[PDB]
Design an enzyme around this catalytic site. Structure first.
Site, PDB file in Angstrom:
ATOM      1  N   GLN A 150       1.016  -1.454   0.458  1.00 14.09           N
ATOM      2  CA  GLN A 150       0.013   0.140   0.290  1.00 14.09           C
ATOM      3  C   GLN A 150       1.483   1.090   0.127  1.00 14.09           C
ATOM      4  O   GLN A 150       1.174   1.811  -0.459  1.00 14.09           O
ATOM      5  CB  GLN A 150      -0.743  -0.125   1.468  1.00 14.09           C
ATOM      6  CG  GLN A 150      -1.780  -1.542   1.656  1.00 14.09           C
ATOM      7  CD  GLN A 150      -2.658  -1.244   2.548  1.00 14.09           C
ATOM      8  OE1 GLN A 150      -3.803  -0.524   2.726  1.00 14.09           O
ATOM      9  NE2 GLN A 150      -2.781  -1.678   3.690  1.00 14.09           N
ATOM     10  N   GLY A 156       3.880  -8.541  10.781  1.00 10.71           N
ATOM     11  CA  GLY A 156       2.625  -8.984  10.241  1.00 10.71           C
ATOM     12  C   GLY A 156       2.931  -9.563   9.654  1.00 10.71           C
ATOM     13  O   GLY A 156       4.041 -10.578  10.552  1.00 10.71           O
ATOM     14  N   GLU A 192       1.579  -8.692  16.523  1.00 16.14           N
ATOM     15  CA  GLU A 192       2.414  -7.991  16.134  1.00 16.14           C
ATOM     16  C   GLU A 192       3.806  -8.512  16.984  1.00 16.14           C
ATOM     17  O   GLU A 192       5.098  -8.479  16.594  1.00 16.14           O
ATOM     18  CB  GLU A 192       2.180  -6.763  16.713  1.00 16.14           C
ATOM     19  CG  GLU A 192       3.062  -5.181  16.120  1.00 16.14           C
ATOM     20  CD  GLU A 192       2.103  -4.412  15.499  1.00 16.14           C
ATOM     21  OE1 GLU A 192       2.032  -4.745  14.434  1.00 16.14           O
ATOM     22  OE2 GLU A 192       2.034  -3.496  16.180  1.00 16.14           O
ATOM     23  N   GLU A 220      26.400   6.095   0.723  1.00 18.17           N
ATOM     24  CA  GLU A 220      26.650   7.191   1.727  1.00 18.17           C
ATOM     25  C   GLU A 220      25.825   6.701   2.744  1.00 18.17           C
ATOM     26  O   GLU A 220      26.447   6.973   3.949  1.00 18.17           O
ATOM     27  CB  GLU A 220      26.175   8.338   1.005  1.00 18.17           C
ATOM     28  CG  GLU A 220      26.949   8.868  -0.751  1.00 18.17           C
ATOM     29  CD  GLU A 220      27.452  10.321  -0.676  1.00 18.17           C
ATOM     30  OE1 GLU A 220      27.855  11.477   0.198  1.00 18.17           O
ATOM     31  OE2 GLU A 220      29.179  10.263  -0.820  1.00 18.17           O
TER      32      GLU A 220
HETATM   33  N1  LIG Z   1       1.901   3.502   7.004  1.00 19.24           N
HETATM   34  C1  LIG Z   1       0.966   2.421   6.796  1.00 19.24           C
HETATM   35  N2  LIG Z   1       0.329   1.476   7.945  1.00 19.24           N
HETATM   36  C2  LIG Z   1       0.465   0.123   7.381  1.00 19.24           C
HETATM   37  C3  LIG Z   1      -0.688   0.097   5.947  1.00 19.24           C
HETATM   38  N3  LIG Z   1      -1.402  -1.249   6.231  1.00 19.24           N
HETATM   39  C4  LIG Z   1      -1.043  -1.554   7.929  1.00 19.24           C
HETATM   40  N4  LIG Z   1      -0.350  -1.101   7.956  1.00 19.24           N
HETATM   41  C5  LIG Z   1       0.561  -1.065   9.020  1.00 19.24           C
HETATM   42  O1  LIG Z   1       0.995  -2.621   9.175  1.00 19.24           O
HETATM   43  C6  LIG Z   1       1.038  -3.434  10.212  1.00 19.24           C
HETATM   44  C7  LIG Z   1      -0.123  -4.047   9.232  1.00 19.24           C
HETATM   45  O2  LIG Z   1       0.179  -5.046   8.667  1.00 19.24           O
HETATM   46  P1  LIG Z   1      -0.791  -6.431   7.438  1.00 19.24           P
HETATM   47  O3  LIG Z   1      -1.766  -5.700   7.016  1.00 19.24           O
HETATM   48  O4  LIG Z   1      -1.452  -7.133   9.529  1.00 19.24           O
HETATM   49  O5  LIG Z   1      -0.079  -7.758   7.597  1.00 19.24           O
HETATM   50  P2  LIG Z   1       1.074  -7.779   6.167  1.00 19.24           P
HETATM   51  O6  LIG Z   1       1.668  -6.986   7.173  1.00 19.24           O
HETATM   52  O7  LIG Z   1       0.588  -6.854   5.191  1.00 19.24           O
HETATM   53  O8  LIG Z   1       1.101  -9.330   6.452  1.00 19.24           O
HETATM   54  P3  LIG Z   1       0.231 -10.445   6.835  1.00 19.24           P
HETATM   55  O9  LIG Z   1      -0.242 -10.539   8.238  1.00 19.24           O
HETATM   56  O10 LIG Z   1       0.518 -11.861   5.918  1.00 19.24           O
HETATM   57  O11 LIG Z   1      -1.140 -10.191   5.544  1.00 19.24           O
HETATM   58  C8  LIG Z   1      -0.322  -2.542  11.147  1.00 19.24           C
HETATM   59  O12 LIG Z   1       0.539  -2.077  12.097  1.00 19.24           O
HETATM   60  C9  LIG Z   1      -0.597  -1.307  10.648  1.00 19.24           C
HETATM   61  O13 LIG Z   1      -0.452  -0.462  10.823  1.00 19.24           O
HETATM   62  C10 LIG Z   1      -0.263   1.337   5.312  1.00 19.24           C
HETATM   63  O14 LIG Z   1      -1.261   1.396   4.129  1.00 19.24           O
HETATM   64  N5  LIG Z   1       0.537   2.214   5.818  1.00 19.24           N
END
Ligand SMILES: Nc1nc2c(ncn2[C@@H]2O[C@H](COP(=O)(O)OP(=O)(O)OP(=O)(O)O)[C@@H](O)[C@H]2O)c(=O)[nH]1
Ligand SMILES: Nc1nc2c(ncn2[C@@H]2O[C@H](COP(=O)(O)OP(=O)(O)OP(=O)(O)O)[C@@H](O)[C@H]2O)c(=O)[nH]1
Ligand SMILES: Nc1nc2c(ncn2[C@@H]2O[C@H](COP(=O)(O)OP(=O)(O)O)[C@@H](O)[C@H]2O)c(=O)[nH]1
Ligand SMILES: Nc1nc2c(ncn2[C@@H]2O[C@H](COP(=O)(O)OP(=O)(O)O)[C@@H](O)[C@H]2O)c(=O)[nH]1
Lengths: 429, 426, 429, 426
Positions: free
Chosen positions: A14, A133, A173, A244
């Site tokens: 994302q 994640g 987490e 760098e």
């Molecule tokens: N800045 C930001 N943080 C995000 C975004 N999407 C998720 N996060 C953060 O990243 C973590 C979420 O990870 P998940 O979406 O659950 O998982 P993933 O790392 O994509 O992988 P899976 O667990 O296998 O689905 C949380 O701490 C969210 O707050 C985003 O688009 N931007």
């Protein structure tokens, strides 16, 4: 010269779509790939009309990578470069690293070996993952893992979005983040960190909006990141190569994690107000309420900062604005470090989304740094872990996924010496 | 990913009709029709519950197990009844006697092989299997006995894929049967040792929640069923949708079960407001957590306020701020630190889909693993002993080829199960 | 060079909006901020095309600051600079100073430290408060308090609107004013005073109107004040810096309180009548019916006057008109003071509201001074206090707000030596 | 800031309908409609009395407490009756007996928890709470007893937020009930020790002021109520408007209560002229103070001229000169130095809003804290003893679980309360 990028995990994807957006946006390359070297260190001039990306996308659920191949930009990447494992994501390290995540890795690598070949003398891979994640913590863990061996001779700067200090999401987490840290630690070059929560504050306090969609935080990192690669790999009055960084930024082999910070965060609608002075933005950099990380310099002595400026900036203005800082003392820099200020000057000013909520100034400061501060952030995240491990909580979810009491307990001990490390390299003279 | 529903017994069956009544509309699948889906997203993940044959006929991939024809012949002779491929109907025209023993050892044991047969035809369908959904009542033959067998076999055939169980534990105040604790204690036994996610619903916890939380004055069964089916849709199917933070059976399982028993939960829906008036829309979010976390509104009989929680999973499904979600959850965790167990820094498992329940703006399924459910197996277990002691209607079991040590077994087991659960309330 | 200003309390804010109005009005800067150094000591050139104010606004009820961000001028200040505490005002010192008022102060300060930095070698903060209020008495008390320590090295001229001699409003007023005096006394440089009632007289006797809206008294001080900062910090034939004041105006450390007086107060509609002579206005200054203060020189010997003139004035005209005065004797100046006449000459004549009720002459005299007269005004206001304290009256309202029998009794004793002070420094030779 | 009205009993309720009848129009809120406000200022501060849900439905944030259905079912079945969210109606279908004891210890005590519940749902609404408005009559069950309880509980839950009380103290000449002094003495007791601002109105002080100050020949209740509601609007809501010199409940409280008893005031409206003719417009200002400060025109029964004042609060609301206001007040303070107490140099608390009562040019609510109200609690207290002595209708109290020492208590307390108040008249 170039720097590939591997956006892993829905989030890393994302954020990826975002950072990837800001890009073309400031390079005149419509979503159709076509614009009407310089920036070749992030885009390959494939065919004779387009500019196929220079990265890849890895998620185990299709949902998120799918959306990329729907919304304009759909045209931007190669149908190939967006890897997926129809299977299951699983918000658990183990499964993503070992069990499932394994199956895909080969294939994954293949691209970062197929995309790594096509180029001309590259510099490294800007990795994008979300610490806590399943696909983001685990997988990468072994992706970066398999890289440090296949290209030990390069830069491994991983741009992470480590666990919100109190506003985490996944129940586990920490399990997933104490595990992505220990496995990647001995493999990264420089790990940039952007705290999801501490960015919200910026959206509340420095832009005003209680309606911050993920799509925004992404626009933000999507900014701070643009200041790293994009513009830097872009000519200027004081160029700063990727190497760098790690050189001027890591005092010690631990894949040290600096923090990302941006200066001009002001909301459109403010867009007309008289712009801020070179001195103000510089100063804004030493405020613990503008750093995309809940690691308020509660004591953490900086030990090296890479002030990347962009736009209309007079080197004296800097070699003065910084001087003033070097003597504020309340900004206490490490002892063993006389001067730790890498001044990176670019030309082209920033480039704000046509109509998001970012001011749009004619100069900015994306300063990143290693601060004895994270001694905290790691601490507070480690403690978390214990509490649960102390009861095994969701342990059966990993064990049953090709892990053991080893990997946990032995990755805990790991970070332990990361709490001592970030303590010793500072607080002492 | 995928799953294969299982309609054990009449109840579990009656509910099938409601679970599929719903789910379909939450996937634009008309009786035999196809995907009329108001959108295009209610299709990219359907597979989880259907199969491709014709091109307009996505048939529910469930099983209809029952030893009483009339039942399935009411579900198959009514509304959506004509969408299940006949192959799905595993009937047992025998005497569907109300005996756990009659549907687990003597009568059901025969019809089993002709079931497993299909449960394999459906499992080996395609792609990758996740687990099976199981509906039934622990107060009858075809439900507790035969359905509790169906799983003991399933869990030997794929100890990998998960097993969610939706049980209609014997309501307190008034039981809809007499041996109830017999058919029950005996099935819970089988549950605590095969399925790994159980969602216990109480016909009277529903009435209440359906007669006071829905000024509904004539709560027919169809309703209760309907409400239940509403929750099981939020759980599964839902998470098989996109989301800022999505989970799936496992996440739900791997975040909710601290200890292997399997543990049983208590589902709770979010917007549960009476039709006209109430349509207050106070659904910003604090209103949903307000809901979900109150005593009443827990499909279970017991009241959370009567025992800590081990885990909680607010599976929301409607565009909201990962901030006003992640945040609320916290205060909630602090206003009630009292009951929420401590050795788990973050009991709550926030989950967040995107698309909401077809006609609603914002909802959130609640799956609680509270220690409160101790005070239910207690109940059941009590009723047993009080009647076991005198071997009440035991001849209907033994006379069906049972054992005096079988009943002993279950009670104890399930009785110990009460014990353990307290080990955390403290 | 500059002089920030902190308008505290609804009143100090109403008067603020007023004094702030007169400003742009005589500087050609429409409510939109834009005009088509000099006056930079009160306005920062944010860029840029605008002229963001150089002050702040502090009220605990939104009502009053809200109205500013409705009516043209809405465009004038920065959305930021107008501080509010949605909470409660409370017409009681204690609550405003201690209990509630406390919470905001930090934030308040921050601006007078953020606005104090941006500038270039400032001179001080013109504070605007209303002695007998909650947010005006209390709060400031600690605002000026926290200033005297953070910038002891500057000027602290607080412009007050002390309690109408008989026409007070609040029932407690004295409690709130014996308390703002004792706490600010050891912190201000020069405290200007403008009596709300004694200004009405001027509106009845020297302008004729029994319809004086608060919006008028404000236009008035809004005038006398313009003569202080505005024009003075503005070039002229006899410039007078802020420091100048306190130096030429306070004989002793007590944050001494001079009185403000204006010369030409004559109503429009009179606007055509032949103008008044340099001698007449000068003389009007020694009339106890034209001084914005019910402290009629009942005996109070002047001890220093700062005759600020503006408009077409010949230095001899002054160095004569004043000479004539120095020898009227019935105007008896202190003993220990040979000459106490600071002649401040500006160029640009006054600038009357387009159509309020102020004459609009081509020369005026805003003479302020320390007069042994206030020996009265303080007396009469102190006595008040006792009467009530003598019965504790509304005492439970403060105690229950983090105060004690101490602060009252010990702030009473305070002023006591202000009744002796203003007595000793005069009446004796 | 905010507040949450409370309609205790029938009276307090009947009046609710009038207080909200008014206030709404003084805020452009049609039955269920939204803000039709002739202006734009009658909205920036509404919150004080409503809540945002729909976007056209700002619902009054009050409570309707009563043990007699018919009542609330008359207020809810008439005009503005359909604006209150049903959740607001805390009824007690029980026998709303006219016994203070029946609505404070036996019958009301039950319905209380189901009230506090809501009084919290409304308090925890949003922003910052200021206090609660309380309407009722001290001459009945649901009024004096149950409403006097509602506060004793409120004042334990937020001893921070204020408590204005609008009591309809038992009119002299004729008592619209028989035990009156019983239900009264018992409620005043509770008042002198919980709420911190009470505005006592007298059905006959109104008649008078309504039949001679308004040539009105048929002053129906609706009227009286209407007049009262006119004052309580000038008080609260009003000050939540801009003003050269504005105040708010506290200022009013922190300027009017010299000694913690809580003290009771006596409200008086300004332009109180008969319709057609009288419309003299003699409202320059000396005309308003002329009004407000006369004997008649004090909603109280007693006459100021019969006892000094401690504090006074002319809360004007209509563009005027802070000079002709601040001034007048003075002469007034000197022409009557006699009665105005001395140990307070400036008894009067001049307050000045801007926008006036919708259709009027200039008004000014008067809130007097005179020692004259001594001669009322005296009255009440007398009636008690004269009948207590013989335990008149006492069996209706005791028989409801009361105490012979309870009545003793109250009288004394409230009786002492008379004493004290004299300590200043001298
Ligand atoms: N800045 C930001 N943080 C995000 C975004 N999407 C998720 N996060 C953060 O990243 C973590 C979420 O990870 P998940 O979406 O659950 O998982 P993933 O790392 O994509 O992988 P899976 O667990 O296998 O689905 C949380 O701490 C969210 O707050 C985003 O688009 N931007
Ligand atoms: N000249 C002038 N005097 C004013 C003005 N507004 C109020 N005053 C006077 O200042 C005093 C009123 O203070 P308040 O408005 O009650 O209170 P505040 O100081 O704003 O602060 P709070 O008590 O917390 O509301 C009275 O003596 C008024 O006569 C104004 O606009 N101009
Ligand atoms: N919610 C719910 N409960 C049901 C339904 N049908 C039977 N039950 C419950 O199931 C129990 C009886 O078991 P039953 O379903 O007849 O057993 P079986 O048909 O022999 O397997 C009673 O506790 C009923 O309340 C239904 O359609 N919905
Ligand atoms: N002003 C006024 N007084 C009322 C109204 N209704 C009843 N009262 C007075 O209230 C007293 C009777 O108490 P009541 O309200 O019937 O008690 P409850 O209903 O049992 O709580 C009498 O003194 C009446 O004059 C009303 O609508 N307006």
């Amino acid at each position: 010269r170039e720097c590939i990028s591997i956006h892993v995990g829905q989030a890393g994807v994302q954020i990826g779509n975002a950072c990837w957006e800001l890009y073309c946006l400031e390079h005149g390359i419509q979503p159709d790939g076509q614009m009407p070297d310089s920036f070749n260190t992030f885009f390959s001039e494939t065919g004779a009309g387009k500019h196929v990306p220079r990265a890849v996308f890895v998620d185990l659920e299709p949902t998120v990578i799918d959306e990329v191949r729907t919304g304009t930009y759909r045209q931007l990447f190669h149908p190939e470069q967006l890897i997926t494992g129809k299977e299951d994501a699983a918000n658990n390290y183990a499964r993503g690293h070992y069990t499932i995540g394994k199956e895909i890795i080969d294939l994954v690598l293949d691209r970062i070996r197929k995309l790594a070949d096509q180029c001309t003398g590259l510099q490294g891979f800007s990795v994008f993952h979300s610490f806590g994640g399943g696909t983001g913590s685990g997988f990468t863990s072994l992706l970066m893992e398999r890289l440090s061996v296949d290209y030990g001779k390069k830069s491994k700067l991983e741009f992470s979005i480590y666990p919100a200090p109190q506003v985490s999401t996944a129940v586990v987490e920490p399990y997933n983040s104490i595990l992505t840290t220990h496995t990647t630690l001995e493999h990264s070059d420089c790990a940039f960190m952007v705290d999801n929560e501490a960015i919200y504050d910026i959206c509340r306090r420095n832009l005003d909006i209680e309606r911050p969609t993920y799509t925004n935080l992404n626009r933000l990192i999507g900014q701070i990141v643009s200041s790293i690669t994009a513009s830097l790999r872009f000519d200027g009055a004081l160029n700063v190569d990727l190497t760098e960084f790690q050189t001027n930024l890591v005092p010690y082999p631990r894949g040290h994690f600096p923090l990302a910070t941006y200066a001009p965060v002001i909301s459109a609608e403010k867009a007309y107000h008289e712009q801020l002075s070179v001195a103000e933005i510089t100063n804004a950099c030493f405020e613990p309420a503008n750093q995309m990380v809940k690691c308020d310099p509660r004591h953490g002595k900086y030990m090296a900062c890479c002030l990347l400026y962009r736009g209309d900036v007079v080197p004296k203005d800097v070699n003065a604005a910084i001087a003033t800082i070097k003597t504020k003392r309340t900004i206490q820099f490490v002892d063993w470090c006389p001067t730790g200020f890498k001044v990176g000057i670019n030309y082209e000013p920033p480039t704000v989304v046509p109509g998001g909520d970012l001011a749009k100034v004619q100069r900015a400061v994306c300063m990143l740094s290693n601060t004895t501060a994270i001694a905290e952030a790691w601490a507070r995240l480690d403690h978390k872990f214990d509490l649960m491990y102390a009861k095994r909580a969701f342990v059966h979810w990993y064990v049953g996924e090709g892990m053991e009491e080893g990997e946990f307990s032995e990755a805990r001990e790991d970070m332990a010496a990361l709490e001592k490390d970030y303590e010793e390299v500072g607080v002492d003279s | 990913r995928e799953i294969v529903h299982i309609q054990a017994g009449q109840c579990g069956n009656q509910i099938g009709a409601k679970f599929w009544e719903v789910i379909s509309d939450e996937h634009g699948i008309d009786p035999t029709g196809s995907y009329h889906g108001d959108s295009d997203l209610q299709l990219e993940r359907i597979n989880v519950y259907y199969n491709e044959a014709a091109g307009n006929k996505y048939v529910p991939r469930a099983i209809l197990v029952d030893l009483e024809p009339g039942t399935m012949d009411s579900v198959r002779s009514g509304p959506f009844g004509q969408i299940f491929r006949p192959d799905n109907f595993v009937f047992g025209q025998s005497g569907a006697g109300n005996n756990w023993a009659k549907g687990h050892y003597t009568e059901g044991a025969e019809l089993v092989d002709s079931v497993l047969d299909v449960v394999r035809k459906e499992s080996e369908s395609c792609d990758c299997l996740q687990g099976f959904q199981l509906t039934h009542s622990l107060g009858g033959g075809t439900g507790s006995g035969m359905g509790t067998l169906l799983i003991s076999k399933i869990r030997e055939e794929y100890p990998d894929r998960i097993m969610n169980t939706f049980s209609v534990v014997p309501s307190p105040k008034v039981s809809d049967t007499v041996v109830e604790p017999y058919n029950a204690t005996l099935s819970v036994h089988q549950l605590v040792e095969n399925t790994d996610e159980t969602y216990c619903i109480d016909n009277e916890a529903l009435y209440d929640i359906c007669f006071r939380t829905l000024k509904l004055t004539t709560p027919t069964y169809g309703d209760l069923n309907h409400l239940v089916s509403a929750t099981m849709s939020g759980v599964t199917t839902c998470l098989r949708f996109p989301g800022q933070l999505n989970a799936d059976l496992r996440k739900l399982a791997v975040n909710m079960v601290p200890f292997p028993r399997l543990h049983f939960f208590m589902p709770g829906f979010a917007p549960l407001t009476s039709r006209g008036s109430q349509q207050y829309r106070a659904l910003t979010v604090p209103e949903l957590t307000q809901q979900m976390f109150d005593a009443k509104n827990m499909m279970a009989a017991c009241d959370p306020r009567h025992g800590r929680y081990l885990t909680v999973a607010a599976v929301f499904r409607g565009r909201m701020s990962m901030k006003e979600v992640d945040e609320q959850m916290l205060n909630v965790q602090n206003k009630n630190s009292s009951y929420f167990v401590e050795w788990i820094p973050n009991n709550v498992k926030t989950a967040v889909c995107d698309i909401p329940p077809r006609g609603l703006k914002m909802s959130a399924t609640f799956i609680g693993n509270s220690t409160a459910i101790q005070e239910l197996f207690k109940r059941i277990s009590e009723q047993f002993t009080a009647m076991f002691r005198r071997k009440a209607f035991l001849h209907w079991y033994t006379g069906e080829g049972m054992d005096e040590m079988e009943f002993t077994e279950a009670e104890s087991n399930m009785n110990d199960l009460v014990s353990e659960y307290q080990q955390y309330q403290d």
